[PDB]
């Protein structure tokens, strides 16, 4: 896309995941499964359900009667009215359409940045303790069980703890 | 070996296709549509207060009381006016109506509207008031607008005829009068006797002296004559002054009127059903928070902005990829 | 040693500059400009079907039939009207025209059109049909609007001018008339005999009456009198009855006429060339697709949104760096 | 620019590249030269092409005729019409101007993203097999012929293959 | 140890908040507001040239010469007009004013302008030029519109009154007349002697003949009568010719006129002060550069865009965080 | 924000900084302190300043007067008028309401980019002579005194200068 994450270095989506838009994927010695991220899948929905609640609520309604009200000797007037209505039609039509697009290119790229910003959240915590496969995954230079993963996730990974076990398998 | 942890995004079996500046037909996981394009097919009340319903009648034929209109509902308050594109029953006896559209604009919506006798048909002890016409026939026999009196000669004399009203009804009063333009001089004589006649009407603001215009015309409803109706708003406590020596189609009733602000007439061939709405269209009512719509241009009420657009689909989720 | 690979972008010899929210005078590799600003200095046919060119006459002068306008090119169909700012030849006999503007508008565009004879000049046996004036001079010899009949007195006697027409010409018909406003009491007497004359006209929907208002006036075109003109559209099958005791300026011709949708008048000095166009301006026609333009406000057809704007330059390429 | 690439960590642009918007320059034992990336340069051109169409096609024309038809006793109408035409010109003028400005800020950055994405798409495929010069180039910790260079441009680099030969040269 | 180098962004004690498409209520460092919302309460001149304060008068009161308006400042050039919603000093003698609205418009903005007499009061030697009235009386004594000569009978004879003038004031002239509409016959006779009178006015573009209409009306300001005023604009080098057998309320003065363009009337009660502005409103002026405002809709001048908006805060700094 | 920096991996901002927007903070043997980046601060200033001038300058105002103008037998015109003045109000209101919401977003993100693009302009020069702390700071593998930092700020840092000296502190 525009942040390269979605439909980019991460080739595709995970049907399996159902509890969110952004998530993780583990393949340690205790099988495999999916798990979305609360803190970032809620920041999303909030500012996206504050995007629709922005384009919708900022509109001014104002009570109006749109109708004829002109004789056959007031055809100049009718016409004037028509130029006006036509006028506001072309304006709102244009604006609305380009709003939809503009706000969609953004919405979509927003989702990208949201992901790419999470991948990095994790990458920048691990560093050399992992092989940056280059596809959204990280390979561990040490066995990482369930209690560990859930500390990479919740954002509390202990680097030093594994620093010395890992600089082993890395070199060789 | 070598354990792994991966980062990815949701996906599903969706087909909601949104568009973007750079790319069209993008499949995404979820989307909202902000283009209201669905109505309910029912013409409904507007803020609870309903439309005056005119059936096959026109505002004019309604106010004057074209017999075919006596079966209309007599609501004392409405929010807009329903009316067919080209009603059948208006000026049964042919003619015209001055500043007619302004009147229609005035009457498009009222807080209060009540018909009221002010110049009773029997007051004219000096004239004949039972005069009808075949163009205004009622069950075979000649008749006339149920709300006007058609003052004519009696005993071959049309004495100078006066009539007045001090507006003491608690609110401004719409009053309508008309003057008759006959086809030929022998018709003027037969109905009025005198000639060089005048119709004079007066208030603290209005002052007209109309002079009947006799002339030949194409029979319309078998009538060469024409009735030129005019109107005014007689303020409260203000008096109105009719005087004429011929050709005066005076009124019997006035209309007390109150306005909360105006609305508009909606052309349609349909009828009121028992439903509510903030926004009515010739095709149906609208109930929506959406910003835009394409239901129909001729709206009444508070309505979303009308656009010449087919679909307007925001994207809520992300891009759906296999 | 050490093999390398590098990633970088295009660049070129491009001066093209664009502005952005944050930066200005920015050079880019290439760009698209979406602001149309070049016409073609040619007044052209519209959507295929030519305009109408009164040249040096007005719609008044044209219709009435000012002698100076007999040489124009009869166009059964058109899509707009070309008229100088202040035409020289209009109402040769000085006066006014009622609902003139409203009329001009009606005519701006017409699916069909064709002058027709309705009330032959010599059918007026009761009165003369060859009166004229010096301000409609046809080479030293006095005359009148080629389509109008200045009915005058015959034998110190002005009968009752009665004339009709059933509109069977297969479609609506523009019809015109007027009333002479003489300079003094005596003149009225000279030309029409009767004083206190009137001019009545009637169709199924129209009833108008004019009455000469005698005032003293500057000799515009060496004439002190004035002729107030009035018009109507007589429906298929409806009839029009003239009836006057004096001052009635009759029609000899009507105009069959069909509409397909309004247009407009363009005040130009230039003339028509052999070309096509979807959108037209005083300066010349436009052939474009861009959203916007800035040639001339007064526009006619399918045109881009006029804007008070100098340049609209979209940056397609990328920032161009050495 | 906004993504750091164009006129950023890649100082300038190759006039040499003549076949696309964003491509590569290599130098191996076999020689040197440019060669733009078929995909990216096409994904972009499609975008931009689509962008100018959105802003043109989405405009409703209708059919108007502006003109007088206002007697000297209908000045107030003349004015309503003026106020109308003058109110719309303003709207359309300010809308165009700002459309451009916005649409321009975004186009330039699209090109930025596009470049940085290519850079990232290559980088992440090479890894510790190369020296990241930080000037928009990678120095190889192994020999890369042409059938090799291609594998990079084409997206099929075989890191595993040159993994061992490289960690060798890389250490010393 | 290990020397470090951290990177970060500016922050401060700012509470200023801005809104984004995704996040509401967001503190920033520096913000520029663009919604002008403060006036000054002082109705200042405009572009250097003052308004035209009228006070408790109507524009009708002004032009004619209602003695209650003698005190007004006759500035020859002005940019706009101030005038209460419901003035008191308008028509002392009840009546009406034709094309009043269009008129009020003409005289909204004027380049040049000057009151210049054209038909002297003492030129009426055959008539009485002092028959004022009570409702328009100065300090008890009956009086009349200072520029409006009330022609009445003298010598129990009312002979045709004539009035002619050639426009040679370099520019156009706004001349104003009126006819009288008496309540009963015995009033007409008492004043004009003749009966079936008339009032004719004439130029190259004008031509009216008013026939005084009589009727019975509620006494307004102790008068049953009414004066119906018309107006015109005499083109350079033209001639306006009156002619009246009675009822005419002739004009004594005329108004040279030149327009650069048009403005409009302001419904204020306040009074002009010694200041300046390019944008005036009922509630005050505006010295702002911002592109928007929410002051008052009814603005005059070169102005921001009036929006139904409370706040328009642009973020200029960066998200401020602890 | 959208570029993960401001309020992202650089949790908070610096009260201690007062001479520009974004800047540094060195912490060696000889003291410690803040130094905002005059370069990337005067470019963004020019940015924003030039932004607010676009939304202000491009507003073509013209000249008009509003008001009654209409009698009591002209209710219709009086209304048309209203349908217009209102019509435009609804437009100008909506446009500006959003125009802000957008511009505000793109502006806060512009900042986030400007911080990110600086943090990378530095990282990519330093490479493995330092230790990416994933907090906004790097820890030098060597002694980096004052006059050192200065060759970094003006972006002329000599990577070869501290290569071995630090490649020693790295491999233990
Ligand atoms: C797609 O999946 C949803 C549940 O997530 C299900 O309700 C729907 O029927 C599916 N669509 C089809 C047509 O397979
Ligand atoms: C009309 O009635 C009210 C109350 O009776 C009175 O004050 C007013 O003067 C009356 N008008 C006339 C014409 O008598
Ligand atoms: C209009 O423009 C098109 C190309 O945009 C051109 O092919 C055509 O000739 C033009 N039409 C005319 C009649 O000049």
CB B148 within 8 A of CB B252: yes
C47 CB near ligand 3 (under 6 Å): no
C199 Cα to the center of ligand 2, angstroms: 43
Beta-sheet strand order (sheet of B285-286): A63-65, B300-302, B279-280, B285-286
CA C13 to CA D15: how far, in whole Å?
A: 9
Residue B57 region by backbone torsions, left for phi larger than 0, else alpha for psi between -120 and 50, else beta: beta
For E210, which DSSP code? Answer: E
Residue E265, beta-bridge partner list:
E81
Residue F121: what are its φ and ψ, rounded to 5°? -65, -25
Give the three-class secondary structure for D120: helix
Among E34, E6, E3, E26, CA closest to E290: E34
Phi, psi of E264 (to 5 degrees): 180, 160
Q: Which residues contact E194 (CB under 8 A, 6 or more apart)?
A: E158, E245, E246
Q: Are strands C148-149 and E31-33 parallel, antiparallel or unpaired?
A: unpaired
How many CA atoms does the CB half-sphere of F127 hold within 13 Å? 19
Q: Which secondary-structure segment (H or E) carries F17?
A: none
| 3-state DSSP assignment of residue B54 | coil
Short-list F61, F19, F62, F65, CA closest to F42: F19
User: Across the interface, do F69 and D84 touch by the CB < 8 Å criterion?
Assistant: no
Angle of helix A75-126 relative to helix A146-153, nearest 10 degrees, comes to 140
Least Cα separation, residue E45 to chain B (angstroms): 35
Please return the burial class of B35, using the count of CB atoms within 10 Å of its CB with bins 0-12, 13-18 and 19+.
Answer: buried
- Distance between Cα C251 and ligand 3 center (Å): 46
Q: Which two tokens stand for residue B204?
A: 């603290």
Q: What is the CA radius of gyration of chain B?
A: 29
Q: Which of B96, B138, B144 is nearest to B121 (CA)?
A: B144
Q: Residues of A with CB below 8 A from F83's CB?
A: 64, 66, 84
Contacts of F104 in chain E (CB under 8 A): 18-21, 26, 313-315
Mutate to test the interface with E, among B166, B202, B206 (most CBs of E within 10 A): B202
Cβ distance F25 to E298 less than 8 Å, yes or no, reads no
Structure tokens at C220: 């515009």
- Name the phi and psi angles at C64, rounded to 5: -50, -45
Query: From the candidates D97, D108, D133, D171, which should be mutated to test the interface with F, based on the most F CB atoms within 10 A?
Result: D97
Q: DSSP H helical segments within chain E, as ranges? A: 59-64, 100-106, 185-192
How far apart are the C-alpha atoms of C131 and C191, rounded to whole Å? 9
Q: Bridge-partner residues for E97, per DSSP?
A: E229
- The closest of F21, F43, F44, F53 to F34, measured between CA atoms, is F21
Q: Is E57 helix (H, G, I), strand (E, B) or coil?
A: strand
d(CA B35, CA D59): 18
What's the token pair of residue B34? Answer: 């902000």
- 3-state class (DSSP) for residue C300: strand
User: What element of type H or E holds B88?
Assistant: none
Asked if C128 contacts C193 with a C-beta cutoff of 8 angstroms, the reply is: no
Neighbours of F32 (CB within 10 A): 12
Give, for D75, the enclosing helix (H) or strand (E): helix D75-126
Q: Say which of A3, A101, A134 has its CB closest to residue D125.
A: A134
| Interface contact flag, D73 E262, Cβ < 8 Å | no
Angstrom CA distances, D94 to B156, D91, E21, E59, F117, stand at 76, 5, 21, 38, 32
E279-281/E300-301 β-pairing = antiparallel
- Crossing angle of helices D75-126 and F38-57, in 10° steps, is 150
Which residue does chain E place closest to B316, by CA atoms? Answer: E22
Give the list of residues 6+ apart from residue B282 with CB closer than 8 angstroms, or none: B266, B267, B268, B296, B298
Residue C125 CA from chain centroid, whole number: 35
Q: Taking the alpha carbons of B181, B185, B189, B190 in that order, is the dihedral positive or negative?
A: negative
Nearest to C317 by CA among E34, E163, D107: D107
Q: Give the integer Cα–Cα distance in Å for B146 and C21.
A: 70
For residue E108, CA distances in Å to C21, E43, E46, E87, E300 come to: 41, 16, 13, 17, 11
Contacts of residue C121, Cβ cutoff 8 Å, sequence gap at least 6: C129, C149, C252
Q: Best mutation site among C287, C290, C301, C304 for ligand 3, i.e. most ligand atoms within 8 A of its Cβ?
A: C287
Q: Report whether C85 contacts C57 (CB < 8 A).
A: no
Domains and CATH numbers, chain E: 1-49+271-322 (2.10.77.10), 50-270 (3.90.209.20)
Contacts of E31-34 with C-beta under 8 Å, sequence gap 24+, read: E31/E313, E31/E314, E31/E315, E31/E316, E31/E317, E32/E314, E32/E316, E32/F52, E33/E290, E33/E311, E33/E312, E33/E313, E33/E314, E34/E290, E34/E291, E34/E292, E34/E312, E34/E314, E34/F52, E34/F55, E34/F56
Q: Are C255 and C232 in contact (CB under 8 A)?
A: no
Q: What is the resolution of this structure in A?
A: 2.9
Give the residues after which the backbone of chain B is interrupted, taking a C-to-next-N distance over 2.5 angstroms as a break: none
Going by their DSSP bridges, the two strands D22-28 and C4-9 should be labelled as antiparallel
Contact call for residues D104 and C315 (beta carbons, < 8 A): yes
**Chain centroid offset of residue C272 CA:** 16
**How, if at all, do strands B133-138 and B141-143 pair?**
antiparallel
Q: How many structural domains does chain F have?
A: 1
Asked whether the beta carbons of E121 and E252 are under 8 A apart, the reply is yes
Kind plus residue range of the DSSP H or E element containing D99: helix D75-126
Pocket of ligand 2 (CB under 6 A): B 166, 168, 237, 239
Q: Which chains are adjacent to chain A, needing at least 3 Cβ pairs under 8 Å?
A: B, C, D, E, F
Distance CA(A141)–CA(C173), nearest Å, equals 96
Query: Cβ(E318)–Cβ(F12) under 8 Å?
Result: no
What is the Cα–Cα distance from E97 to D84, expressed in whole angstroms? 29
Q: How many CA atoms lie within 13 A of C278 on its CB side?
A: 9
Q: What CATH number has the domain bearing residue F14?
A: 3.90.20.10
C-alpha–C-alpha distance, residues A85 and E204, integer Å: 39
Q: How far does CA E117 lie from the centroid of its chain? A: 21
CA–CA distance, D123 with C7 (Å, rounded to integer): 10
How far is CA A92 from each of CA B291, D103, F128, rounded to the nearest angstrom?
10, 19, 55
The pair of structure tokens assigned to C280 is 């037209």
- Name the residue of chain E whose CA is nearest to A62's CA: E308
| Nearest to C128, CA basis, from C65, C37, C191 | C191
In chain D, helix, strand, coil percent, each to 5? Answer: 55, 15, 30
**What is the C-alpha separation between E55 and B112, in angstroms, rounded?**
37
State how far the Cα of A69 lies from the Cα of B101, in Å rounded to an integer: 6
Q: CA separation (Å) from C72 to B128, C48, C80, C136, C270?
A: 60, 20, 16, 17, 16
Rounded-to-integer distance, Cα C150 and Cα C142, Å: 13
Strand duo E17-18 + E26-27: pairing: antiparallel
Q: Under 8 Å CB-to-CB from D66, ≥6 apart: which residues?
A: C264, C297, C298, C299, C300, D85
d(CA F100, CA A30): 51
Determine the straight-line distance between the first and last CA of chain F, rounded to whole angstroms. 38
Cα separation values, E144 from E69, E131, E132, Å: 12, 8, 5
3 state DSSP class of E2: coil
Range of the domain at D128: 1-172
Q: Among the atoms of ligand 1, which is closest to the Cα of residue A18?
A: 5
The tokens for C85 are 């700012």
Helix axes F75-126, F146-153, angle to 10 degrees: 130
Give the span between the Cα atoms of A146 and C198, in whole angstroms. 107
Give the Å distances, CA to CA, from E197 to A21, B71, D89, E8, E315: 92, 50, 54, 95, 76
* Number of neighbours of residue C168 by Cβ within 10 angstroms: 11
Residue keyed to tokens 């399918």:
C302
User: In angstroms, rounded to a whole number, what is the distance separating the alpha carbons of residues C197 and C191?
Assistant: 11
Backbone CA torsion sign across F54, F60, F65, F70: negative
- How far apart CA B191 and CA B197 sit, in angstroms, is 12
Which residues of chain A lie closer than 8 angstroms to E23, CB-CB? Answer: 47, 50
DSSP classification of residue B50: P
- Say yes or no: B14 contacts chain F, CB-CB below 8 A: no
Please give, rounded to a whole number of angstroms, the shortest distance from the CA of F4 to a CA of chain A. 6
Q: Where are the alpha helices (DSSP H) in chain B?
A: 59-64, 100-106, 185-192
Rounded Cα–Cα distance for residues B75 and B54 (Å): 11
C276 lines ligand 3 (CB under 6 A): yes
Burial class (CB within 10 angstroms; exposed 0-12, middle 13-18, buried 19+) of D62: middle
């Amino acid at each position: 896309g525009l942040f390269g994450a979605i439909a980019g270095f991460i080739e595709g989506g995970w049907q399996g995941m159902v509890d969110g838009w952004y998530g993780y994927h583990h393949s340690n010695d205790q099988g495999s499964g999916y798990a979305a991220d609360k803190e970032s899948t809620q920041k999303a929905f909030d500012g996206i359900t504050n995007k629709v609640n922005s384009v919708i609520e900022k509109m001014n309604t104002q009570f109006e009667a749109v109708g004829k009200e002109f004789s056959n000797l007031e055809r100049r007037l009718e016409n004037l009215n028509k130029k006006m209505e036509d006028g506001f039609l072309d304006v709102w039509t244009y604006n609305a359409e380009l709003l939809v697009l503009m706000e969609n290119e953004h919405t979509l790229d927003f989702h990208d940045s949201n992901v790419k910003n999470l991948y990095d959240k994790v990458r920048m915590q691990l560093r050399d303790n992992v092989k940056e496969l280059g596809n959204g995954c990280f390979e561990f230079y040490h066995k990482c069980d369930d209690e560990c993963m859930n500390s990479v996730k919740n954002g509390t990974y202990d680097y030093p703890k594994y620093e010395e076990e890992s600089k082993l398998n890395r070199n060789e | 070996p070598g354990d792994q942890i991966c980062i990815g995004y949701h996906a599903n079996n969706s087909t909601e296709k949104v568009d973007t500046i750079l790319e069209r037909n993008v499949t995404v996981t979820h989307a909202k549509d902000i283009l209201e394009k669905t109505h309910n097919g029912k013409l409904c009340k507007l803020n609870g207060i309903p439309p005056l319903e005119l059936g096959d009648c026109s505002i004019a034929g309604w106010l004057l009381g074209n017999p075919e209109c006596d079966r209309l509902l007599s609501v004392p308050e409405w929010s807009y006016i329903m009316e067919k594109e080209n009603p059948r029953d208006g000026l049964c006896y042919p003619g015209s109506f001055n500043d007619y559209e302004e009147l229609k604009h005035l009457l498009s919506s009222v807080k209060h509207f009540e018909k009221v006798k002010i110049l009773p048909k029997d007051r004219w002890t000096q004239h004949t008031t039972t005069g009808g016409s075949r163009a205004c026939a009622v069950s075979g026999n000649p008749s006339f607008f149920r709300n006007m009196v058609w003052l004519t000669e009696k005993g071959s004399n049309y004495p100078v005829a006066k009539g007045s009203y001090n507006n003491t009804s608690g609110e401004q009063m719409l009053i309508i009068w008309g003057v008759h333009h006959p086809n030929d001089e022998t018709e003027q004589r037969t109905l009025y006797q005198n000639v060089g006649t005048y119709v004079s009407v007066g208030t603290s603001t209005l002052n007209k002296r109309s002079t009947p215009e006799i002339a030949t015309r194409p029979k319309v409803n078998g009538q060469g004559g024409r009735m030129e109706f005019s109107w005014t708003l007689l303020d409260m406590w203000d008096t109105i002054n009719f005087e004429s020596t011929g050709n005066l189609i005076a009124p019997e009733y006035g209309f007390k009127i109150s306005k909360r602000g105006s609305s508009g007439i909606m052309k349609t061939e349909g009828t009121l059903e028992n439903c509510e709405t903030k926004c009515q269209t010739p095709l149906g009512a609208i109930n929506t928070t959406l910003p835009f719509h394409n239901v129909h241009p001729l709206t009444i009420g508070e309505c979303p902005k009308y656009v010449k657009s087919e679909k307007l689909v925001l994207a809520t989720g992300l891009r759906n990829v296999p």
